[PDB]
Paper text:
Pteridine reductase 1 (PTR1) is a folate pathway enzyme essential for pathogenic trypanosomatids and a promising drug target for diseases such as sleeping sickness and leishmaniasis. For the Leishmania species, this requires inhibiting both dihydrofolate reductase (DHFR) and the trypanosomatid-specific enzyme pteridine reductase 1 (PTR1), whereas for T. brucei, PTR1 (TbPTR1) was shown to be essential for parasite survival and therefore its inhibition alone should be sufficient. We determined the crystal structures of five TbPTR1–NADP­(H)–inhibitor complexes with compounds 1a, 2b, 2c, 2d, and 2e to resolutions ranging from 1.58 to 1.85 Å. In all complexes, the crystal asymmetric unit includes a whole TbPTR1 tetramer, whose structure is highly similar to the previously reported models. ,,,, The 2-aminobenzothiazole moiety of all compounds adopted exactly the same binding mode in the current crystal structures, as was observed in the previously published structures and in most docking results in this work.
Therefore, to evaluate the possibility of targeting subpocket C, we tested four-atom-long linkers, as present in the amide-based scaffold of 1a. For 1a, in the top-ranked pose from docking simulations, one halogen bond forms, together with the expected hydrogen bonding pattern of 2-aminobenzothiazole. However, the tail of 1a occupies subpocket D in the second-best pose, suggesting that such a binding mode is also possible. However, the other three compounds crystallized with TbPTR1, sharing a para-halogen (either a chlorine in 1a and 2c or a bromine in 2e), have the amide linker in the cis-configuration with the phenyl moiety occupying subpocket D at the entrance of the catalytic cavity. Notably, one of the top two predicted binding modes of 1a is consistent with the crystallographically resolved binding mode in TbPTR1 (compare Figures d and a), with the exception of the orientation of the amide bond (which, however, does not directly interact with the receptor and probably depends on the water network that cannot be fully reproduced in classical docking simulations). Furthermore, the positioning of the 3,4-dichlorophenyl tail of 1a in subpocket D of TbPTR1 is likely due to the fact that the para-Cl of the phenyl tail does not sterically fit in subpocket C with the 1a linker (while meta-chlorinated or brominated compounds, 2b and 2d, respectively, fit). Finally, comparison among the compounds suggests that the presence of the para-halogen moiety (as in 2c, 2e, and 1a) prevents binding inside subpocket C, consistent with the QM predictions (SI), suggesting that para-halogens are less favorable than meta in subpocket C. In some subunits of some structures, parts of the ligand tails are missing, whereas the 2-aminobenzothiazole cores are present (in TbPTR1 complexes with 1a and 2e, SI). 1a is the best T. brucei inhibitor, showing an EC50 of 3.1 μM and a selectivity index toward human THP-1 cells over 16.
Author numbering:
A (entry chain D): 2 to 104, 113 to 142, 152 to 268
B (entry chain B): 2 to 103, 114 to 142, 152 to 268
C (entry chain A): 2 to 104, 113 to 143, 152 to 268
D (entry chain C): 2 to 103, 114 to 142, 152 to 209, 213 to 268
Amino acid sequence: EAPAAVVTGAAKRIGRAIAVKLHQTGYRVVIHYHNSAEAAVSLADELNKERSNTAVVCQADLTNSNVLPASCEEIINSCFRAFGRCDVLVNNASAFYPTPLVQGKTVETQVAELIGTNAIAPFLLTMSFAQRQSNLSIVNLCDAMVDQPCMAFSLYNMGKHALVGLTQSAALELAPYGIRVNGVAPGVSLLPVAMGEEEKDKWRRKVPLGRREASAEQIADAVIFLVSGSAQYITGSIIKVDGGLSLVHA
Amino acid sequence: EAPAAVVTGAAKRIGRAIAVKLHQTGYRVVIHYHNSAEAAVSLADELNKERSNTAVVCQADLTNSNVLPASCEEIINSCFRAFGRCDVLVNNASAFYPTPLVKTVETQVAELIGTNAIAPFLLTMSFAQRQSNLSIVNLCDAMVDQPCMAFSLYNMGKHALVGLTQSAALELAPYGIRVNGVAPGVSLLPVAMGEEEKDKWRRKVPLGRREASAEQIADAVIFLVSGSAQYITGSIIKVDGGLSLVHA
Amino acid sequence: EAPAAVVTGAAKRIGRAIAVKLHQTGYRVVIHYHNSAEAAVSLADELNKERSNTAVVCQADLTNSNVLPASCEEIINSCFRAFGRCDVLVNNASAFYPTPLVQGKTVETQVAELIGTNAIAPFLLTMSFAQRQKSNLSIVNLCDAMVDQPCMAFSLYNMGKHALVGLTQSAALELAPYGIRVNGVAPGVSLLPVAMGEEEKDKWRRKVPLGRREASAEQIADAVIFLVSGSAQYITGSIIKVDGGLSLVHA
Amino acid sequence: EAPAAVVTGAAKRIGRAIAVKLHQTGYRVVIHYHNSAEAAVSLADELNKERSNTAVVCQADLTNSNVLPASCEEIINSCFRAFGRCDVLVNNASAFYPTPLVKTVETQVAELIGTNAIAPFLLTMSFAQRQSNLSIVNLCDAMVDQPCMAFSLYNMGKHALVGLTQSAALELAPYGIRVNGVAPGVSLLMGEEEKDKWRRKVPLGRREASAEQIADAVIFLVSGSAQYITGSIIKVDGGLSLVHA
Ligand SMILES: NC(=O)C1=CN([C@@H]2O[C@H](COP(=O)(O)OP(=O)(O)OC[C@H]3O[C@@H](n4cnc5c(N)ncnc54)[C@H](OP(=O)(O)O)[C@@H]3O)[C@@H](O)[C@H]2O)C=CC1
Ligand SMILES: NC(=O)C1=CN([C@@H]2O[C@H](COP(=O)(O)OP(=O)(O)OC[C@H]3O[C@@H](n4cnc5c(N)ncnc54)[C@H](OP(=O)(O)O)[C@@H]3O)[C@@H](O)[C@H]2O)C=CC1
Ligand SMILES: NC(=O)C1=CN([C@@H]2O[C@H](COP(=O)(O)OP(=O)(O)OC[C@H]3O[C@@H](n4cnc5c(N)ncnc54)[C@H](OP(=O)(O)O)[C@@H]3O)[C@@H](O)[C@H]2O)C=CC1
Ligand SMILES: NC(=O)C1=CN([C@@H]2O[C@H](COP(=O)(O)OP(=O)(O)OC[C@H]3O[C@@H](n4cnc5c(N)ncnc54)[C@H](OP(=O)(O)O)[C@@H]3O)[C@@H](O)[C@H]2O)C=CC1
Ligand SMILES: Nc1nc2ccc(C(=O)NCCc3ccc(Cl)c(Cl)c3)cc2s1
Ligand SMILES: Nc1nc2ccc(C(=O)NCCc3ccc(Cl)c(Cl)c3)cc2s1
């Protein structure tokens, strides 16, 4: 049997690069998506063509609500249903937008999305992963800039901080079960869709190492390392993949 | 006119000590509470006996829900209606219990993330929007990177509060509102905890082998709101007697 | 009687502001200086005119060498000789200059000054202070809020300030059983270099979120005063940033 | 031809594991040593037998003296001499012993600050000066924020090494030289009952890290899979640093 992995928000961008690279390493993959139905199915088709029966999709809103636990349970369940095991969880899915403290989503909704996807869903997915339980491991996508945050991004920042706390707490608690829990913290990687090219180059020029953003593959590379046999004593660790960005003063 | 302060969970223990010290410092105080009505009123009466019309109480549940934003807006409002201004917010209220990975889970999330993180954020928003030496102090936790076993949601909330501290410091600094934290290690231990178990914690503290008094925590809060902290924002002061420096 | 404090590099700038504030709080002070003799004696004079017999000077190079331990021992001894006690040590003295990796002091000299003043002398003074102990004893170390986002080409300075964090933690742990607290104060941008030009100063000022200005020497001293006070009696191993939010600002 | 690595203190324990793994990965390697000539040569023998003329040794004392600079220049040199290039520097060599606040102190400084911090800084300068996937890996310590009682100078030096890692990453990024750290917890350990005490504290498997586990992290950091990673310190501690008092 090949080991199996769940990757959240795996339809596009970094999650996709992680799913692809896990697959290329021998994993069967559950491709979680929320809205990117077409891109999801397209990836699974591409992976299944490469080796049949090695990729499924699973749809779920990771917004906080009273039913998020059941949705997270379902994501993990889908991996056992498809593949009879679940060896790796990658908590990649993420909402990211400004929530200024000083003044068309309600604040209730902003909290639900930013805290639910970035922190609560990871926690619930971790809980379901552990409960349904080898080289078992969880990788959380954190954020190298969490201590030098973007202005007006307090809820996102709060969620990413909470994710660091989850990384530590679950590493401690799940170690006796042989499950390792680690983090990968991008600096600037795949830049947003609705962002101009002056503004892209603004960000690029701040990166000491090469004056450019991370490829999604460069982020995936770190994920690969942490799940691998080369990381069997690593737990509770967060690896920044930021080209020095977090070292740069204002 | 005397400045005013809101202290959440102010009825008992650390928040009580904070409210009293701010009062003794010359502040008028909103004593926020959840269940502890009798304790909150009795504190208010004592402070008002010391100085007339300087203390009011305000009831609210800080658990995460669709109505928490309204609740927090009202807390801040209560300070303005009582005293005509709101100079200081102390985010002290906290839920703290284990949530093992292996009450419903939704309730646990709502209580531990709502009280520890989301309500502070909502209160911070309301405080800033309704605007001197304005400042916010959040009660953090010195042991957040060396957490208690099976306290993941608690720890996530306290980490989130560190993020809020930093993020709000950055964003509110142009308005002249400072935002800082106080991170106790072991302070007031549960009353009902056995002395032999309290002693296990006490013995771990390098500095004097005892827990912090509530007054010692309040002392750091007083500093951060004071004119001696006018350039300090986005700082978290550990008040932990060296406990976080101690290896396993 | 009145408590006594040693403040290193106290002739000018932040060290002076710390000595002054400790003095105004009722402390007797040793003003340590290296080169700034005129300025040291002037300050002691001012303080002595305010209350007599309350300020002494003490000269010492804090560059690392085989005699640095003796020099640090002597600084501490100066306090016991003048005032009969030593309650507070402020490690303020600091060398600060670029040491580029890829490149007229020798490298030997750079290491001795930047690592000596910023880390080894604090460690030796800490040892001497604690050993001489026979109340509210504490040590405050002047750290740097920007140690994790350092200036380009300042590796030795940054290494010494990182060592000083390590000293702060290690000494807080070890000395707590003796009742000695050890904490730090970490400025961001405070008094800018005397040599720096106004346009350069203003570039730095505009980076500070809280007020777009540097900390005053007094504002730094305020935090020192808090940590030595009875208001900080349970605080040890803490480093308080006094930086106006500067360390939170991304590139 | 094939890339070349320097590993300091590579004769035994953690440094040897790093040396072997880099060799296995296809690096030509300099095995630096202070005292352990026998061990160094023996390792050299083993690696040359697998692949001819791909491992040399280098003597240098890394204590803090007026000659440390020259020593560190020599070490980097010997890599360019043997192999005509130097792709990777692993700063592994390290001293470790208590220095209570309550050997002359300056030997202590020269060892604990000298070997642990100043020589890395000097080797970094020489490595950089003489310049691809170039990078430097510094052996840090995961327990730096919760230090052993009475280990102030040691702790100070390891904190200084974090400072160097960050400052050098920033400064050398323009030249395509990455600079990173690996922070072991309890690895190869002292009595046997004392050692057991430590093992039981570790969340992940109640045992010390093998030297090879440390070396694995180094390998990752030098590899093409880490081409965007600089200024990062990877803990390899089995979760020990997460455990409270
Ligand atoms: N990109 C960067 O430069 C950096 C990224 N990171 C972190 O790395 C990770 C990957 O980054 P990146 O690829 O840019 O992320 P994206 O912003 O592209 O988001 C990843 C996926 O998250 C999913 N998602 C969003 N909201 C929800 C929701 N309510 N329910 C379920 N899924 C949801 C989306 O799925 P769908 O499309 O199917 O709706 C989306 O495609 C994230 O955790 C991010 O925070 C860290 C810092 C830098
Ligand atoms: N004591 C210690 O050793 C430590 C404390 N801290 C932090 O210090 C701060 C003060 O500590 P401490 O006094 O021990 O705190 P407590 O655990 O005693 O709680 C403080 C107050 O929080 C309020 N609270 C709890 N749940 C809710 C809720 N759902 N809605 C509204 N209010 C609620 C309660 O108000 P009411 O009684 O009126 O219902 C309670 O009196 C906290 O933020 C805590 O996490 C951090 C480290 C250790
Ligand atoms: N100023 C700022 O913006 C910032 C300051 N800091 C820290 O705050 C503290 C105070 O800063 P600031 O007042 O600007 O410090 P200065 O740069 O003005 O230096 C203070 C004193 O250090 C002494 N000193 C320098 N080299 C030696 C030596 N070899 N032997 C003995 N004494 C020596 C000098 O004494 P003398 O004049 O007698 O020769 C000098 O007056 C320092 O530790 C500094 O690193 C941190 C970050 C920002
Ligand atoms: N082992 C552990 O549990 C821990 C490891 N680490 C770090 O991992 C690395 C490896 O640790 P470990 O293998 O135990 O190291 P050791 O303490 O065993 O020493 C490593 C090597 O350093 C060399 N060395 C020591 N002093 C000098 C000197 N003055 N001049 C030149 N060379 C010198 C020696 O080479 P030679 O034999 O030729 O003299 C020695 O074999 C170190 O950086 C250490 O701090 C971090 C925390 C804990
Ligand atoms: N709102 C609160 N937050 C906190 C955070 C930490 C502590 C604390 O340190 N309590 C004592 C130590 C301790 C550790 C572990 C457990 Cl099960 C328990 Cl009942 C108590 C106590 C509280 S109360
Ligand atoms: N002993 C001293 N230590 C420090 C540490 C930091 C600073 C400081 O922040 N100075 C202003 C920033 C700065 C940045 C770059 C350069 Cl060339 C210079 Cl002359 C100064 C100044 C000093 S002085």
